[PDB]
Subunit: 323 residues, 6 copies
């Protein structure tokens, strides 16, 4: 294409740990974890009567605890709720350590614009060097119906998470569990020569995951898979993780500490894909040494979109090496 | 999201029985059936030379027969055909009992607008209390390509049906049967350690069903699955029904009387989902008793989109209770 | 619908053979092959340092070799690269035999517009009777995100090919092979009564193929599946071909000569679908004999969209008969 | 531009006479007039209680009177009113003489689509050779805000009329007269060296007329100016007519018989513009004699848009010659 | 049209007085003025170093002074500036008396959305009965280029003001004065028979005013003209006011107390237009007495858009009567 | 607004001289002129049979003559014509001195995209430091109807010229002269107390000029007025120039050498506007010295859009100083 997209800021994002702001002990324990990204939650996991205190707890946690080089985020309240403006104002004013805001229930691009206006103004007032990035949750049918447009809604936007349980609720999917599969979401084969019919299970989230993936990959964002509720089923977690990784997802939520190592292992890039990326970068250097505008590797032209992907993958591999 | 959608009129729609207008005996028998919704057909099931008479038959049937509290609909002829304007004019003028119009082959939002103009004018002339609702058939590749836009095309719009057989024809899918699965729409696994390769069947309608579902659920409509042709295969019907129900579909067509009970059973909401909805409504009442703007259930904020879903589900459960 | 689309020029397109322009011997051998469509490649298969010569080779091959009635195409370089304008100018100026241009990596409708401007001007200068047609490659996440818009981007546009390997690269799908399936892109079933869990493989390209199919079928284009890399696995090729054919795809690439017969066999229309189309055409003639505007077959109205599909299928069947 | 628009059907349209359907005597007298275009009105000039009879009157007038080669139109009731569907159905069914429908108060493109659906179906039923054309009234702020989109809303669309009095009402312009100027819509000059300030009158309809003109001329339609109410002021009529003619308008309404000759005289094309158009057509013939793709006149390339304008102007000049 | 727009909340808005928040004495004096609408300014008239205090001053003024039944507004800082979020949060939290927010420099619809999100959340927190309305300033070329889209950007939106001086700056118009005319923005006539050429002055703001007017009147908003700087020139003020009133503008800014009476006098509706509106309302009552859906006045159908305009004008006339 | 536009490359553009490529003597004489910008024409002024030679002439002129620091442009042939691709390829390949391309008859944004693709590829091949800029001619009703969209069509786009004579032809305006005014484009005043009626001339190009101006000023481009044909009427030229300058236009075409000094004089910025811009830049420096994010001048906040305008004006003033 003649149309070129710039990749978002290239962070390592294999594991995304959710931590309720209402639990300072859990926040403290999380600061020493192996998660790549942590969000401190003001939204779904925090009861209304606890939201004001959780906000205070999070300010203290972001300012006092040692988070290392983790990408630190908050999940703000919904735009449809009165809590949100104080989440953004109080925390962004008080907490230089904050890296990102996770905006829930995003439905249309203007939702993201709204948060960009507010965030920008606070950063202007505080004379901030760091600029906050955004992650959006696609966790409703409305957001899914507008996902491609949402993907281009802010220069801050870096990533989208698939909120599977809230998406199920929004679509009225038959789901009593967070994530997972369903014996009813299956095909019954036509009778074979023996008179037999098999039941082959299908993926209830295939459509959602692929559509969000395409939006992310078209427009330079990280595609992240959401929560998996069955803490007693690491095999099921790992299957779900490997399935979305196979599509191109870059990471997955952890909502129980056991899930952190599982996500980290699955979403580590292969040695081979890192090596290919490194060879692309050396082929770029070669083209510059030769005075040649076109980059070639193993007899193939490597185009600018492909160079940009290679640069992003290397930044991620390099982060792993220094963790 | 800050963007809020109003749910369509909340009807019970588990089973949708198709009845040709060319058969007054079948229409009479259908009036005593257990279908939730009936459409009297002027379109696909009626030969051109029979369309004028079928129109007359339907006027007589809507005016004379006892349909109970069924949602009564007509499937009008295609907008590309000369029959349609007389279908709408003659029946809407003559038949106060009519509840809805099923518009076939919808391709773009302006198709729906056109029917809204005509329907509105006739209702104005007749000084009608009741306002007719619309259901649209997504049964062509054109309609599927525009489904999200179609979903917002009229305040009358309540529901979309996936016309699987006509959709197959439009896409040139290999299909000689109405609905069902296909041994060729399958994956051949890579050889395992024993040298073996399995054939795992896939869902040829997954993309179509999910895209239409997302449009419906984003914009407040009922997602309805279309016909299944093999009357000798209730197990296959039930599998197809349970599979789309698992996604969030609300009902399915019956094109043979045996299919009515099968659809009714599958698309009845679970006791648990009705109970959750009832508890949401009591949590709303609680918030009002306490003077609190935010509704809480089991320690979780229940947002306005979720309240609106609960209200719709209850209206549907209540209808079942009075049938 | 009241909105009507005109079908593209109706070519037989079961097999699409890729031939590198850097290999004149391979080009010569390809001219005697059984492929329906051949593209002479200047892009992915040709190293940068060989592109200028490949352009010359292709001019000689198009002018000198006997291609029969094959649809002859070139795959031009990417719009993001300096080679492209000379590909179009030099070949279109010199080579009346050329039938079509395959535009790679298409991202937005204006990419196609750009090639239409250039192609048109050269045809105006050369006073050409024949008008070149376009095929577009949807082989990036950007193109997939804009596929519906791309489908309406030029009166020359006839077909879209799904570039599976480049699409995988763009989406960061885990893929070291061109096409095929993936043991990780699978679901792990919930434990049954015996404590057992099965692994049911899913289709990593279902979303992509279906979305591109819908765009094509909505807007009158041929949907074509891209390359399959495992030349040692005809069973896998045939499975992949039959799977997309079941959806409605019309043909598939051959990147090794063995794949030509496999594609030709799979994408031949059934005797039954050709017979139905022929009966539609005779029903049209019947309606004209009777003075009737509506066409009827076996008691069903056959609408204009359906007539147009029948006419296209017959043109394709007729081509097979004369090959 | 590479984007090319097809001109509408090229009718002579200098004068457009409005005749109320409630007055059969006036309709009879109008049939012998010198108007180019006549619309028989069911809308603004006909009281509600007279609309049903006016419809009958118009059917009789269109079928019985001798209208010559006039372009014969009806102004249907508003889409927001119950009268309209019977206007279209009854008259189009009964009256082959009808040439066009004037759609009032058009606000959005889908308004035009709606009338195209209904009109098409009736024409299909009646097996009509002639296809009815459309004229739209831009007579509200809504329509003006959407005029460019309305201009591309139907293949039937030929012309737009600026409904000045209804537009004034919609905008709350201070206007007690149909059309004309306003001493208050003026500028007061800054004091000159003598201390004097002049009042220079401005054109209250400049914006409206120019915006509608641009939409028409971009998209191949006739721009027509609406009514002027002061029958005692032919000088004012002629000034208003010459002012919009200077912009490129092609005709103007007559709402009193005296205005017909005034419009005909003003909107006759100059001898010079007809001669230039004729020379363009002979230059086209010259290019064909020489085997040259580019047309040249007096040393200037004459492009396809300019040829199409010349062809339209000649068709209009030829009509005048045969009147 | 079949598309119907709801009118904004119908306030009397002849005069709009600008009062800097940095001047508590001027605010006090303004509370006893005859202005219909007052905005307390935090933006253009307040130096950066005074903005924090002006915010405090305005809170005190809104809470303590007697504003009568005036529509009370604040002009917040620009969205591009850090002051704005504290303007909205502090004042909306503290000041139930506030009626509206005037949003400056609006460029795109999402600017308005952003303020709607923030305003809504604060109102939710405060459990407000009253809902704040919005006025937007169209005072840049960007806003003018997007004015039609801005007009539909919020259910709160009631009015647009043409910020002539800031618009001039944005367009680089030659303007050293706020508003007014320009000897250079004139036409030099062609020589007449005496050899003479006149200079006829044109309206430099005609395009801007008319485009904004059309957006407002299409979408149910009040069109308001902005400031006029020459306090020594009431004749020029009155000319400018009468000129935009003639188009349909509903009011004008006062930036000096002398301008209040001038705006009030010019933008009072005529006795005749109020009488017509009253007769429309009595014709509506008549139609209801007769059981007739169509409203008729003096032999003309009065449509719903026209009824809605009449209702709005009466609400405004009634307000004047009670002032 | 929160939406921010980047200004185009800031060139001095008071005078734009048109020089036919068919006249090498005129090209030589033009190189020593006082024009700011020169376009060497391949389009309107060059007969078809002379276009191939004019292309060669221009290559020689751009490579051999001394153009000083003039902005050097070519007016390429229309996209609808076969000449264009060779204009771009041959000249851009051969002529590093070229600064810009003037694209004629632009109708839609994709026209500009097309030229951006071709231009970019040639620049890539030639390994150019300089990047060519674009100017577009808005000289048709189609382009005027799409002008706002065209304004955002390429990062190369710097300027739009109003092609008055071609625009008149496209709109069918009564115009036998290039530019100028029209006694018929006038208002006839209502009789005064003496029985008199005046004729006040209006501006036939007001709508066009203002709409194009708004598009330019919204999106960071230079608005340039087109040709004036009456070389014997410098007073009329100067009036036309001062009239568009008053709106904010930045320059005007010269099509006769006498017009160069007239344009240069009119479009020189005032001493006062340059001084204000310089004071803005010193206020920016002041804010940086004080550590303050907001810039203040004379008690007013100077926003980023206003800073960017000031920077552009200064770059232009500085250019004048070094000419
Ligand atoms: Cl979730
Ligand atoms: Cl079907
Ligand atoms: Cl590929
Ligand atoms: Cl009117
Ligand atoms: Cl202002
Ligand atoms: Cl011109
Ligand atoms: Mg959630
Ligand atoms: Mg059907
Ligand atoms: Mg490729
Ligand atoms: Mg009217
Ligand atoms: Mg301002
Ligand atoms: Mg021109």
């Amino acid at each position: 294409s003649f149309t070129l997209i710039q990749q978002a800021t290239p962070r390592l994002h294999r594991s995304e740990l959710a931590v309720p702001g209402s639990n300072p002990t859990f926040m403290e324990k999380s600061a020493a974890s192996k998660a790549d990204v942590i969000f401190l939650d003001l939204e779904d996991a925090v009861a209304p009567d606890d939201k004001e205190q959780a906000r205070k707890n999070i300010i203290q946690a972001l300012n006092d605890l040692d988070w290392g080089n983790k990408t630190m985020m908050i999940r703000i309240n919904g735009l449809d709720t009165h809590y949100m403006y104080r989440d953004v104002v109080d925390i962004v004013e008080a907490c230089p350590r904050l890296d990102m805001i996770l905006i829930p229930k995003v439905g249309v691009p203007a939702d993201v614009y709204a948060i960009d206006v507010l965030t920008t103004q606070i950063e202007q007032a505080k004379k901030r060097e760091k600029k906050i990035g955004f992650e959006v949750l696609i966790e409703t049918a409305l957001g899914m119906a507008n996902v491609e447009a949402i993907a281009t809604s802010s220069k801050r936007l870096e990533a989208m998470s698939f909120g599977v349980a809230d998406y199920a609720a929004s679509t009225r999917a038959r789901s009593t569990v967070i994530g997972g599969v369903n014996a009813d979401y299956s095909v019954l084969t036509d009778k074979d020569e023996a008179g037999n019919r098999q039941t082959h299970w299908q993926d209830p989230w295939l459509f959602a995951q692929n559509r969000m993936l395409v939006a992310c990959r078209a427009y330079g964002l990280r595609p992240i898979d959401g929560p998996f509720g069955d803490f007693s089923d690491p095999d099921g977690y790992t299957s779900a993780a490997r399935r979305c990784a196979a599509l191109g997802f870059e990471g997955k939520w952890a909502i129980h500490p056991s899930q952190i190592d599982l996500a980290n292992e699955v979403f580590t890039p292969s040695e081979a894909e890192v090596t290919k990326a490194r060879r692309i970068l050396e082929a770029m250097e070669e083209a510059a040494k030769a005075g040649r505008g076109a980059v070639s590797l193993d007899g193939r032209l490597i185009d600018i979109a492909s160079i940009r992907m290679a640069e992003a993958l290397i930044q991620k591999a390099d982060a792993m090496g220094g963790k």
